[PDB]
Amino acid sequence: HWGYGKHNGPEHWHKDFPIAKGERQSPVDIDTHTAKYDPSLKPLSVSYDQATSLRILNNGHAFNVEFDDSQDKAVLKGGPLDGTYRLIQFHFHWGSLDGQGSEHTVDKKKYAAELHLVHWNTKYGDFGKAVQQPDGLAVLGIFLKVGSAKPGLQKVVDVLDSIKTKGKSADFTNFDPRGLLPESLDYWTYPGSLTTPPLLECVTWIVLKEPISVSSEQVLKFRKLNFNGEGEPEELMVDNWRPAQPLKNRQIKASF
């Protein structure tokens, strides 16, 4: 199936998922001098106080921290969004080296990693129906740079040993995603897609300008994870990012 290798990577995805070459694919390069301040943007509202994490899963491409979305708890609203979007999961994309890993880029700059907090529009009842809609999803993107450790990330880092290989999962309750946010909620926004097959064009992207810093030791543990399943030859889970895709006359708006 699809992956990130020479033979199954982003360059191959279009064969099974023709939308890979579509009109609103992600990620994209954010050209800071082309993005326009949008005064019609409402303030962004990130309400994660009542968030209920359930478990962490290695799915063979990344790891997902999943949340209970059976009622309005962790929600994203405001900014470019209309209505309420519920947090369902978060995951990261990262590199084999610090100089690469992020999916979105800023004036062609690649960060060491990128965090995606995935939310679905409550108007559509559930995630499965939301991904059939042009405004079905909102993803909050946060860049990671290597520097000081991120205290709020360590709980995730420590559990990774227990989910080394494809298909493994661990109980992961009472994790607070507020510990992953930078200070400023300044962002760029554009209409786009899921960055993994099947690459569905249902996402309002909200990409925070301010990166969070994580320690070299924290990122190193991400890189210890495996793409393969248990008892299979070791394939380190690294460089699980899609590169920047054509903007196609979409407009990136800045909140600041």
Ligand SMILES: CNC[C@@H](O)c1ccc(O)c(O)c1
């Ligand atoms: C339904 N919740 C989405 C999450 O579990 C998810 C993450 C990455 C994927 O490739 C995928 O098919 C699903």
Ligand SMILES: [Hg+2]
């Ligand atoms: Hg869609």
Ligand SMILES: [Zn+2]
């Ligand atoms: Zn992602």
